[PDB]
Amino acid sequence: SSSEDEDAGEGISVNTGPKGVINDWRRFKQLET
Amino acid sequence: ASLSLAPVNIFKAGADEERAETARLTSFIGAIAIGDLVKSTLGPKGMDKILLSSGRDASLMVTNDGATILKNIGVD
Numbered sequence: 805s806s807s808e809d810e811d812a813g814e815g816i817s818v819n820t821g822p823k824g825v826i827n828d829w830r831r832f833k834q835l836e837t
Numbered sequence: 838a839s840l841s842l843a844p845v846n847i848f849k850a851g852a853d854e855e856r857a858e859t860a861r862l863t864s865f866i867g868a869i870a871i872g873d874l875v876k877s878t879l880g881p882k883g884m885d886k887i888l889l890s891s892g893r894d895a896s897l898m899v900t901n902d903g904a905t906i907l908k909n910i911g912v913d
């Protein structure tokens with residue numbers, strides 16, 4: 805009833821680029837030092 | 838199975854090794870790069886290099902000598 809459970813080229817040797825960028829390199833290097 | 842490409846790791850942190858192809862490639866690249874750099878300073882029409890030191894002194898050298906060029910470079 806209702807009731808239920810529901811309920812390559814590695815060697816580079818960069819030539820001139822370091823010379824070109826040395827200005828910024830030293831700019832950062834002074835503050836880092 | 839090589840030391841590098843094995844399931845267990847046998848090296849310190851930072852230690853590595855290059856097998857046949859890699860070792861030969863590294864050696865050939867380094868040698869050819871050194872030879873290409875030192876050349877063009879060879880013979881009567883060879884030109885000189887500029888050795889710009891990156892140290893505190895920042896020494897400047899102009900040379901055509903192969904040994905002088907080769908000794909003043911940081912090669913790994």
Ligand SMILES: Nc1ncnc2c1ncn2[C@@H]1O[C@H](COP(=O)(O)OP(=O)(O)O)[C@@H](O)[C@H]1O
Pocket residue numbers: 878879880881883903
């Ligand atoms: N006047 C010249 N005519 C032809 N070849 C030359 C002359 N002078 C030098 N050479 C050649 O240039 C070669 C390289 O010499 P050089 O460029 O001084 O560097 P390195 O002597 O250090 O190898 C030598 O093997 C030599 O035979």
